[model samples]
Target: GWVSGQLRYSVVEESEPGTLVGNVAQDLGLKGTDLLSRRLRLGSEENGRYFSLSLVSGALAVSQKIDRESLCGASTSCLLPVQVVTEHPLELTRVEVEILDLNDNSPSFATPDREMRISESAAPGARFPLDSAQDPDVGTNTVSFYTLSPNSHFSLHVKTLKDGKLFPELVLEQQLDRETQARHQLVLTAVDGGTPARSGTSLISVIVLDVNDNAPTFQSSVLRVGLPENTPPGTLLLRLNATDPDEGTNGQLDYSFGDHTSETVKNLFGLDPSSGAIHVLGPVDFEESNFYEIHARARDQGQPAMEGHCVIQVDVGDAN
Candidate 1:
């Protein structure tokens, strides 16, 4: 996980055209344009467009251009082997250069667009795993952290393994209802730690499966209505509507009066089971009683019918 420090004479980079690599002197200086006792010679195998050896000054420097990508394309390390010889004593010392990788590449995913299917029955704490990105540069230049698009339904999580590799996962932050929305699309981002920083993105589509988990209920648990006294027997009062977040049979609602209402109250207030329309079946006596409590129920057509109830208050106001 960690590399040792570099030496001043070893592991140099190819930056400038004449960057000083090293000098071949240990004790009393004996090499130069005037030195007859010291003469430096490059190995026969080291005459190319990338290295330069000074025979008069006993100095080594970079001579040609070096492109890290063209040299080793995403590899972790790149090494350049060099052999040097000294005259007057016929001595050979092998010199090597390790090309440090530069952060010249960005991270990318194998698939720009990804798809995942999540069951509606899954709990809010459920986790969905994902694959890591690919980067050519090693060390901190590789993929670092990941992010998920802002959403209240889910959140992004990251993990590191024993091998120092990283991966991503998604955790459910809130519950999901398929009938409310069947599909959702979100963007995931992967960023690298370069000098200027580099990043990539992937589109993730989530599909929620349908299940009969929600029941039909009136929009409100309680409703208040006003009716004028001396209203005609068939005068229309108000209509009640129920809503359900289920598919097919589980969403089909049938409205009716609950068992809490007596026969006398049912006959006084006519309720149309087909459309949930309530009307005046008899004259409204506001002088005697100014209020009436009505109870209603809604049931879906599913095999195991789910039901909901509501209480409506009708205020009888005098026409005078």
Candidate 2:
């Protein structure tokens, strides 16, 4: 009889009655009782072949009893085929088993959560060390590849080496502005191709380092020279020029009068936080304080604020 190739088999012992074994011989028009020797030999009844009973459910487990010659005839061949008689037509069911891979390696980072300084002019294709993941499974079951999570602000490419090392190629797609983006946070993942595939993930936090690459520029260099002689205590004086070479918070500037005599000037001059503009807030005297020298400075918001100072010399002369 033809059996389905998908059928699986297991050997089981039959210990209970009412459990039908199956037809013993084919072409003999035999049904179930053919397995009993007394039944086959017509009452010769010494248990003609005390057949070792084995249960046959479906293809999962099939049993057969064969003579010594048939059993010894083929050492490599499986046991003789037995035909199973069921209340319903015998049908074999197929089963498929799948094995899964296990995660063995702990997650790691290629670069530590430390500071890194790279030139703003760093070219593309700059390669950096990225942590690699490994699986203890040998051969094809080992970790085979790596991947970066989606929606990352920076683009990442993975490069694999024969020595079981992985390197990450980082491309600075957009120019980094320290003020806008002080630091970058990222998460990376590593995966392996096993029976069902396994994965490990790690996090990488990068801080953008600063450099003194900016020069200072003043807000205004020249202004009108005039003031009344009898001015109020909090009188207005000449404002200084504020400078900044870079953009954003790093380019911010602050204002200060040179001395307490300039305190009158300090109270008089006000600076714009965003624009670094100096303005006169009160009245100024030409006779009482004819000459004024004030100093102002521009400072960046970097770890160690970089500063630049400018001096403003103001002279008050009688108007013609």
Candidate 3:
């Protein structure tokens, strides 16, 4: 912003110094004696002119001396231009000062290390902020583009912000996966257009956020287990185990009998949630439903749960 106002001026005056008078000095004036000599010899001379005889007289020292030689030259006046530099149009309420360009500064980052977590399912052309770097210099000397480290897991992209919109240019050459590599780290450099090229570097640490893309798979794709039909209640049956490549809650499993029909048999089977154990709640009779179909489901806790299913065929016979 620039200041604006109308210009005005006013005149000021000062008083002149008063003249000195003395009766002895008047007679000296008629004789045309120099004031300095008469003042030095203060006592009255034969012509009635008072002379100052003392060496230290106040009146002689108080007179104003004029240099005639210095006044012989003509007076010269200098008029300086009242220059105004502004970026505002006439009749505008405000103005801006356009700072000129300078190749003085190097790029910088808000943080020394930039961290990001992304899933392996992220498609090609996925873009993330590389942590911006800035140059104190203005105009063309400022940071113009970005470059990524020469590695296989990470890539760099150049972008421009125009009217608050971004246009990107991919600079790196590889893709990343969590199953293959759980984490990655790289250094990115910001370069400017100054002479000899000024540059700054920042470290980027990327953690592959896990996703339930992999389904739970049975350790043995097919399960074959035998059970005694006359077995007592709480009998232990062969266990079916399934594993999920995902971690944490994503690998939990639940078991159930697929063909539970009769009330006695429906409540006859029980599974341990934590251990995936199969036990008989009540005795099973081989005369009825000697073969049973059991199903084990492993599901991930991720949103839109991912699950895998496997069937178990149970052979029931009389105990030997």
Candidate 4:
């Protein structure tokens, strides 16, 4: 006759020594005058490296350590088929050893690191591609979802294609502003499905390209400077400072003496195109001109040059 019974066992890898797996007579319904005479036999009973049975008594013990990861890689549920055979009146029993997984492997990034560049003018709904993470364990032990470090202008979302492929992407929720911040650093974290979950991180560098949106701006609406009538030619009069909120060429400032100034004043004054320096070009007389007010123009080298102006006043005072 054939007897059928479902056998299941749960043991962590490298479990403590002398852990009893199952009992032969009580669990498998073996009853006879002498339990030892039945000769309990399991498949590979003689050569089994992990399991052992008592020939004198019906007792099963784990002889060697069992590593589920090494046994079944990336498989959440692991099972080993075993046949329990005994002969006294001739009987066959079936048993299955199920291997339970423990959190042993960590989530890893498919691409360890990455670099990206985007234009500041890029609008919302812009998509950037990134590789997903991988884990050597399956099911909940594998990677669950992804999280992005907190950021104001950008966010992240994980996507699964129709073909069942998983990947990570950066979605632009807000417009980028290079003037506010040129380069942004972000961290991408991959978490797994486990209690007290384990996670890993990768780095992302986003460099926002420049756009011509802002015009040149003066530090102050008006600039005032004082000098003596005896001020010598080529004298350093004043340094005009201006700012541009744009980036690159858009932020590059070029200085010039503005219109509505007499050629006499132009010949008497000098300006540095690159340095924004205003210097004297000729001798000055306080009696002739007690004060000199000039319009200073600043322009950026964008596609459509944007300009700004400030009143630069030089109060010519008498020299003792």
Predicted model with the maximum lDDT: 4
As a whole number from 0 to 100, the lDDT of residue 255 in candidate 3 is 49
Model 4 residue 191 CA deviation (Å) reads: 3.5
Error of 4 at 120 (Å): 3.7
Candidate 2 residue-wise lDDT, 1-320, digit = tens:
32356322222222233333332333223345433422232111222232222222111112233222233221322332322232233322222211122233333444444344554434545555566664544345456666665533467777767865566655565555554465676666756656567666666666655554554555554344554444454443444555555556656655443333357767655655445555666655665677766565656554356656666665655532
Best by TM-score: 4
* True-structure Cα RMSD, model 3: 20.9
The total of clashing pairs for model 1 equals: 0
CA lDDT of every candidate = 0.75, 0.46, 0.53, 0.79
The 10-residue segment with the lowest total lDDT in model 2: 54-63
Root-mean-square deviation (CA) per prediction: 7.3, 14.3, 20.9, 5.2
Question: For candidate 1, what is the TM-score?
Answer: 0.60
Off by over 4 Å in 2: 1-124, 149-153, 163-165, 169-175, 216-226, 229-320
TM-score of each: 0.60, 0.41, 0.54, 0.68
Candidate with the larger TM-score of 2 and 3: 3
- Evaluated against the true structure, the overall lDDT of model 3 is 0.53
Q: List where candidate 3 sits over 4 angstroms from the true fold.
A: 1-105, 119-121, 137-144, 151-154, 160-180, 193-198, 259-267, 318-320
Q: List the residue pairs that clash in candidate 2.
A: 9-60, 10-60, 110-131, 217-243, 236-282, 236-283
Candidate 4 TM-score, C-alpha based: 0.68
Each model's number of backbone clashes? Answer: 0, 6, 10, 0
